[PDB]
Amino acid sequence: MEDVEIKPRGYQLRLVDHLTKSNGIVYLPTGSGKTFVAILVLKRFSQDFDKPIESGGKRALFMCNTVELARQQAMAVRRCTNFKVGFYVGWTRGMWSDEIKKNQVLVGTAQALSSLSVVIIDECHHGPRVVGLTGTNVATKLKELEITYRGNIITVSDTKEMENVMLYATKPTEVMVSFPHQEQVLTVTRLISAEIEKFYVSLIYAASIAIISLIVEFDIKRRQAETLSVKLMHRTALTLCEKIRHLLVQKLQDMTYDDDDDNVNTEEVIMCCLVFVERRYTCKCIYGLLLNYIKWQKSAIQQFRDGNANLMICSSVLEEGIDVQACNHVFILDPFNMYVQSKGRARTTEAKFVLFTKEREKTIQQIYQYRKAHNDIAEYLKDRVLEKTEPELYEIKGH
RNA sequence: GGAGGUAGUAGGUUGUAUAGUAGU
RNA sequence: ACUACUAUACAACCUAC
């Protein structure tokens, strides 16, 4: 219930007040101080169940599939607290030992294990005091209750006392409907399809992955050729051929890599913010053409979160546990399901958001925008006391 | 590395429901 | 009413991407 650096918000302090001596999942939106409220309850954790006693202690652990989030939460969040912090990624017996009491709070990947009374599970909804982390109506309520039963969860932290601090810190993303009519160019359609048909008919796991990567790149460049003729067509073809040729040196792959580069370039010769797409070649072509015409992971992240990069391309695995500073908006090309998943990474200062693309319109309105019925299902599960949760977990423990 | 999980699509099988046709 | 075939929808399992 304490504060690491910034003053704790009223919504984050009320949600972590009942989690001191209790155990349960805590869900907070980006920009609302999620990780800030995590160190809050963690400060009162080791200061109660562990301290004053030196012998008995609780080592906070973090289980996440992303290796970049291990040192992340262990520096701007865990290290800011008065308690010790540490990061271990790919022995762990020295940091988890209660005798030395060195680096209590830890973070890493791939998870005596019962010696720690405080345990945290990051992204546990996709599957001692256990604390979880998360972002039809009968199917959603049954899945959330089953995860909270075996996952050792009772009280769910949410906005109750003050609901104004929720939308104030995290601004709602504006939904902008954009339906471009450019998809597949009918003019000279057999010329662009000749290279994709010749590459697919030229074909174990290495040969199939190279053919699937060229087919996915040609399909992404086909829709990008309608918007920009020679911009994204020559950029995606040259980057895909150079990456396959520089990955390995072989006489069999040299004929397919050299021929795909010369044929695609000759046929296509005729003429801060966040982004998510399946192919990174289309995002690099749009950012490269806009900035020209009027070991690498450390240098790229240094120029991204600092504000020097106006465009950032992420992936499906990189869409969670991210931090963006001065984000103008978030766009998606070809990637309430993905809505809150992509926007849940980081918070943007501007509430306006656009999506690059007959389609959607009333069709996407019924499928998406499920937060209306999801609000009643999430509120009913978070308001359940420990009486109904105990009987559900005890009866299902035999399975 | 390795690997599992998640999500979508396609195919096959099984169960249920509905509609149509045929037989008793 | 029962049986068989076909089509659609839902659920489960397996395989592939």
Give all domains of chain A, ordered by start, each with its CATH number. Answer: 10-169+375-395 (3.40.50.300), 183-271 (no CATH), 272-359 (3.40.50.300)
Look up residue A213 and give its two tokens.
Answer: 């990567």
Counting every residue, how long is chain A?
Answer: 399
Please tell me the distance from the alpha carbon of residue A16 to that of residue A126, in angstroms, as a whole number.
23
The residues with which A296 forms a beta bridge, in sequence order, are: none
Please tell me the distance from the alpha carbon of residue A262 to that of residue A269, in angstroms, as a whole number.
11
Resolution in A: 6.8
Which strand C bases fall within 7 angstroms of a protein CB?
Answer: 17
Please tell me the distance from the alpha carbon of residue A15 to that of residue A158, in angstroms, as a whole number.
6
What is the CA A358 to C1' C6 distance in angstroms? 34
Which 3 state secondary structure label does DSSP give A331? strand
Please tell me the distance from the alpha carbon of residue A368 to that of residue A337, in angstroms, as a whole number.
7
Task: Based on DSSP, count helices (H) and strands (E) in chain A, helices before strands.
Answer: 15, 6
Which nucleotide has the least CA–C1' distance to A136?
Answer: C10
3-state helix, strand, coil in chain A (%, to 5): 45, 5, 50
Please tell me the distance from the alpha carbon of residue A343 to that of residue A322, in angstroms, as a whole number.
10
Please tell me the distance from the alpha carbon of residue A297 to that of residue A66, in angstroms, as a whole number.
14
Which nucleotide has the least CA–C1' distance to A127?
Answer: B5
What is the CA A142 to C1' B19 distance in angstroms? 33
User: Is A14 in contact with A162 (CB distance < 8 Å)?
Assistant: yes
Please tell me the distance from the alpha carbon of residue A352 to that of residue A321, in angstroms, as a whole number.
21
Which 3 state secondary structure label does DSSP give A346? coil
Which nucleotide has the least CA–C1' distance to A209?
Answer: C17
- CB atoms < 10 A from the CB of A245, how many? 17
Please tell me the distance from the alpha carbon of residue A103 to that of residue A89, in angstroms, as a whole number.
14
The residues, any chain, with a CB within 8 Å of residue A263's CB and separated by 6 or more, are: A195, A198
User: Is A117 in contact with A124 (CB distance < 8 Å)?
Assistant: no
